[PDB]
């Protein structure tokens, strides 16, 4: 239930070893306290599967690599024994209670609910397969449509928990079908938050933005990682998707972002950057870019896929806006504005220009930067023909296929 999302997040710091030394140390001790207390031992074993000769490994119940910069994930054989003890004892006692309820009459309410309680215990300890089956029993029995949504969501949480995106994908499709049929708004809010984070883990942040602005206005905290991280997610997507004006009105249409103030390192680093883009600060911007890499992207489960992707894209935006507003610049001055040297600056630019998402050229003899982006009738013409070509292609194959048959 609620404890799962904290454990995974701390666990992702052990998965990485490109993170800070003191940070990874801290995270191991927390996870160990809750392995004892809440039974997080099956998922501790799941971490070594995610390695086998990879950094962040040190396990002694499995494969070891103390060459790894992590050496605080080490198992104990006290741990191996504590696992087996609790695992068996708890399943056996909790099940016996359920067996009694099945003997007694009323299955509409009493028995389906009793089966939910099994799936929450397996959800907790990180067994995905065993949770699915028993909550598979709750859904089989006719109940409220709101409950069915609640249960699918408990299952969907477990895909991020192992950080397997395929498992989420599948499950959130069933939620979309049943969200309208229930027509409950309680869990409509949750669904957007879940599905927001799935969009975050894949490359479409545009959708992510549209779901996560709703999640600011109303947040549903159970089974969903805490509200300071949700701010950090809205801000990530905000920087990528929008441009100055839109960005400014978004974070003033969210009062809550400003009133929450930076209260965690990841939130601080993203928020510093948000301001500087829209206020058109370039001076301190270039350092903040480095901070976001360190304290948001690599520590996060879902943005660790986007560590190289984000930094690459974000630099295009900051340059784009300045160049659109100018016919010409001088290179030395443009370098100074950001805080780089002249030669250094070209290199970044020179990857963006032939992809032709920056529409410019650089004289190296005048030292001027020319901007020759059409924004007239010529641009609309240039876009349109690509779509109209697309229409030609769609018809060329479909035409042939029907005529032959």
């Amino acid at each position: 239930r609620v404890p799962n999302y904290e454990v995974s997040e701390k666990a992702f710091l052990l998965t990485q070893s490109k993170v800070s030394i003191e940070q990874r140390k801290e995270a191991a001790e927390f996870v160990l306290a809750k392995i004892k207390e809440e039974e997080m031992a099956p998922y501790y074993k799941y971490l070594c599967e995610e390695y086998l000769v990879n950094n962040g490994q040190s396990d002694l119940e499995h494969d070891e690599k103390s060459d790894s910069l992590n050496e605080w994930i080490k198992f104990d054989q006290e741990l191996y024994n504590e696992l087996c003890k609790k695992n068996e004892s708890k399943i056996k006692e909790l099940n016996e209670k359920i067996q009694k309820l099945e003997e007694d009459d009323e299955g509409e309410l009493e028995q389906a609910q009793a089966w939910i309680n099994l799936g929450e215990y397996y959800a907790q300890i990180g067994d995905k397969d065993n949770a699915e089956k028993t909550l598979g029993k709750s859904l089989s029995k006719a109940i409220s449509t709101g409950a069915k949504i609640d249960v699918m969501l408990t299952i969907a949480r477990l895909g991020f928990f192992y950080n397997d995106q395929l498992y989420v994908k599948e499950k959130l499709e069933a939620v979309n079908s049943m969200i309208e049929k229930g027509g409950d708004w309680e869990r409509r809010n949750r669904y957007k938050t879940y599905y927001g984070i799935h969009c975050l883990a894949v490359r479409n942040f545009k959708e992510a933005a549209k779901l996560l602005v709703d999640s600011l206005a109303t947040f549903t905290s159970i089974e969903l990682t805490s509200y300071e991280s949700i701010a950090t997610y809205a801000s990530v997507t905000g920087l990528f998707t929008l441009e100055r004006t839109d960005l400014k009105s978004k974070v003033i249409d969210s009062p809550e972002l400003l009133s929450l103030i930076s209260t965690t390192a990841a939130l601080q680093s993203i928020s510093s950057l948000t301001i500087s883009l829209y206020a058109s600060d370039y001076a301190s911007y270039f350092p903040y870019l480095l901070e976001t890499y360190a304290n948001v992207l690599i520590p996060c489960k879902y943005l660790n896929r986007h560590a190289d992707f984000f930094v690459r894209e974000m630099r295009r935006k900051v340059y784009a806006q300045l160049l659109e507003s100018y016919k010409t610049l001088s290179l030395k001055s443009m370098a100074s504005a950001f805080g780089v040297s002249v030669a250094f600056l070209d290199n970044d630019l020179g990857k963006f220009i032939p992809n032709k998402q920056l529409n410019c050229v650089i004289d190296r003899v005048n030292g001027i930067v020319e901007t020759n982006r059409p924004d007239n009738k010529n641009a609309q013409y240039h876009l349109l023909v690509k779509q109209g070509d697309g229409l030609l292609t769609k018809l060329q194959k479909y035409g042939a296929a029907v005529r032959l048959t």
Partner: protein, 54 residues
Amino acid sequence: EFKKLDDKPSLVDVHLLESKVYHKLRNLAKSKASLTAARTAANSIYCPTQTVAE
């Protein structure tokens, strides 16, 4: 709690404090919402000159 114990003209003050706290946190959405509440509560006639000034 003082809505179970509501007889109080002293929550009028509590609303005005609430507005100031939100304003300096720089949300005006709920600074306006509490301020609106405080205006309504002082429409009923018991309020000091000080209270109306605030």
